[PDB]
Design a protein around this ligand. Structure first.
Ligand SMILES: *C(=O)[C@H](C[C@@H]1CCNC1=O)NC(=O)[C@H](CC1CCCCC1)NC(=O)c1cc2ccccc2[nH]1
Ligand SMILES: *C(=O)[C@H](C[C@@H]1CCNC1=O)NC(=O)[C@H](CC1CCCCC1)NC(=O)c1cc2ccccc2[nH]1
Lengths: 303, 303
C-alpha cells in the first residue's frame, strides 16, 4: 500500500537530452532522430529581450553559431529552422538512443513527468500537472529551459511540454514539442499574469478515492449531494466546476470502492466548508489535485 | 524557482532490473555484473511463511528452480548463495548496462530515490527517506519486492535499500544490498511494529530555509531561542532532538539566507505550538521532513 507522487522512469528521455549554446546563452535540447529541438529564445541577447523579432534575429544568424553537445561529445548542426517558438537544428548524426515517441498536446488537468536538466545533464524527475491557467507548478532555475515533460505508454514516450519561462508568481510556462505555447503566453520578457489558481475537482475526488483504497476513511459522510448544490459551493473556493463527463471518468473508482461519486462530492463539500481540522489524508493536510483518475488506478494496481 | 519532491534520474538503475521467479513466487532482482540480487523470501511457500528456516528451505532447493528474465530475455542461473537476507544468483551473462555503483548503508534521516518495479519492469520513481524507526513511507504493492532505492553522485550509483515487506501500519521495511535489514525488522510473517513516528527536525528546518529562498517568509519571527528551550517543547510533538552537529549541517543554509539557525528554531517553535492556521508553506500545510540540507542545496543551485 501507500500513495506518493510518482514520476515515470527517466531513462528513455535521458539519452535524448543535449546542451545547446548560441553565443552567451546555454540551455537544453531534445535530440530525436537527426533533429535537436530547443526554445527559439536561445538566439536572444540582453539587448533584444523585451520585444524580440525572432525572424530578424535569425536573418543575422547562421547554423554555425549554434553549438550542440551530447555529453563531452559534439554534434554538427547542418541546417536550422524556426517552427513556431521552437528551433529545429538538423544534426549530422542521428541519436542512436532515440526512442519510440510521439508529440501530443495535453489539456488542463492532465499530469506529466518533468525531467529537469541543466547543461544537457539530468538533475531530477518530478510529477507535474497542466494547471487550469495553462501554467505548471515546477522547480526550474536558470539554464533549465529545454527540459521536457512526458508520459510513457507501454513502449512509447509521449513528449508534451518544453520549458520556456517563469511567470512573476513563481509558476512556469512553456510550449508543446511543435512550438505552440500552452495558454495565452508568449516568449517575450513582458509581464504575463497567470490568473486564478483553480483546483482540479475531478483530480481531488480521485485522490480521495485513493485515500479510501488505502484505509483513510474519516472524511466519509453519510450525506449525499447533487451536481449543482456542489458546484454552487465549490465555485466560491475557486474549484473547477464538475461535469457529467468527470462523473463518468470517476466511474471505475466509485465502483472499486463502493462509494458513489455524489457521495464523495458531499464528503468534499464538508472538507471545503468545514475544513480538515489539522487531520491528515494520505499524509497531506490539503486537498491534492495533481493526481488524475488514471494515475490513481495505475499506482494502486500494476505498472 | 519552485521546490518539489525530486527523484534522481532512473535510467542507470532501469537496465539493472530483472524478474526473479522461484515456483509460484515472482519478484524483482538487481543484475549487477554477473550476479542477480533479490530477497531470500523468494523461496517461501504459503506453508512456511510464519517462521521459515531459510537454510533448510535451501538444502531442498537448487539453482535450477530459480528463473531470471531480463525482459523477454532469460539469463541462466549457474550458482546461488544466501548472504544475510539476500540471495545472490550467479548468472552466465554479465549485465552490459552495469553502471559504476557502490553499496552503502544510509542512516536515519537520509533520503533516497525508489524505483518501484513489478515483474522486472519499472512502474515509477519517487523520493523517500529512512524514517527514525528504520521504516520508509512508500508505495509498494504485491510483486514489488526486489525494488531498489539509490542515490546518484556524479557517475556513481549508490544502492542503499531493497524492498522486503510492509508493516501493519502501512509503512515498509527492507535491507541494504548486502542483506542486512534496517532496524530490528526480520523476514518473517510476524507482526513487527514500527514504533513512534518521529519527525526529522534538521530536515524540517532545511525545508523552511528552502521556503525563504523561494519567497515564503510569513513564518519568520523576530524571536530567537536556545537549544534546550526548543528541545523541551519539540519533545512533546515527537520531534527528533536537535544537536550541535545538526546546527553545523545547517551552516550553509543559515548564511545563504541570513537567518540564524536558532532564529528558525524559534520560528518552528511557534509553528508547532500555535500551528500553521491553514496557511501554506511551499504548497504544503504540514511541516515537511523528507528534504535533507543537501537536497535543498542541490535543487536550489545546480545539478
Ligand atoms: C531558461 O533557462 C529560463 C528559465 C527560468 C529562469 C528562472 N526559472 C525559470 O523557469 N528562462 C528565462 O530566463 C526566460 C528567457 C526569456 C528570453 C527572451 C524571451 C522570453 C524568455 N525569461 C523569463 O522566464 C522571464 C522574463 C521575465 C520578465 C519579467 C518577469 C518574469 C520574467 N520571466
Ligand atoms: C513483496 O513483493 C511483498 C511486498 C508487500 C506486499 C504489500 N506491500 C508490500 O510492501 N512482500 C510480502 O508480501 C511479504 C513476504 C513475506 C514472505 C515470508 C517472509 C516475510 C516476508 N510479506 C509481508 O510484507 C507481510 C507479512 C505480514 C504479516 C502480518 C502483517 C503484515 C505483514 N506483511
Amino acid at each position: 500500500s501507500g500513495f506518493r507522487k510518482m514520476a515515470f522512469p527517466s531513462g528513455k528521455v535521458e539519452g535524448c537530452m543535449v546542451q545547446v549554446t548560441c553565443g552567451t546563452t546555454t540551455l537544453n535540447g531534445l535530440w530525436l532522430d537527426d533533429v535537436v529541438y530547443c526554445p527559439r529564445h536561445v538566439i536572444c541577447t540582453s539587448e533584444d529581450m523585451l520585444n524580440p523579432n525572432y525572424e530578424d534575429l535569425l536573418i543575422r544568424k547562421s547554423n554555425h553559431n549554434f553549438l550542440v553537445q551530447a555529453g563531452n561529445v559534439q554534434l554538427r548542426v547542418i541546417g536550422h529552422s524556426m517552427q513556431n517558438c521552437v528551433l529545429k537544428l538538423k544534426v549530422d548524426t542521428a541519436n542512436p538512443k532515440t526512442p519510440k515517441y510521439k508529440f501530443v498536446r495535453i489539456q488542463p488537468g492532465q499530469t506529466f513527468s518533468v525531467l529537469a536538466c541543466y547543461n544537457g545533464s539530468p538533475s531530477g524527475v518530478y510529477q507535474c500537472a497542466m494547471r487550469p491557467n495553462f501554467t505548471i507548478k515546477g522547480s526550474f532555475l536558470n539554464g533549465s529551459c529545454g527540459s521536457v515533460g512526458f508520459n510513457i505508454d507501454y513502449d512509447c514516450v509521449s513528449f508534451c511540454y518544453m520549458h520556456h519561462m517563469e511567470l512573476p508568481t513563481g509558476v512556469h510556462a512553456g510550449t508543446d514539442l511543435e512550438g505552440n505555447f500552452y495558454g495565452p503566453f508568449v516568449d517575450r520578457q513582458t509581464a504575463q499574469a497567470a490568473g486564478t489558481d483553480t483546483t482540479i475537482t475531478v483530480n481531488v475526488l480521485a485522490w480521495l478515492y485513493a485515500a479510501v483504497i488505502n484505509g483513510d476513511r474519516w472524511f466519509l459522510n453519510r450525506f449525499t449531494t447533487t451536481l449543482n448544490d456542489f458546484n454552487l459551493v465549490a465555485m466560491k473556493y475557486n474549484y473547477e466546476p464538475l461535469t457529467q463527463d468527470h462523473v463518468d471518468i470517476l466511474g471505475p473508482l466509485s465502483a472499486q470502492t463502493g462509494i458513489a461519486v455524489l457521495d464523495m462530492c458531499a464528503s468534499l463539500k464538508e472538507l471545503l466548508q468545514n475544513g480538515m481540522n489539522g487531520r491528515t489524508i494520505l499524509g497531506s493536510a490539503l486537498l491534492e489535485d495533481e493526481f488524475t483518475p488514471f494515475d490513481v488506478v495505475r499506482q494502486c494496481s500494476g505498472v
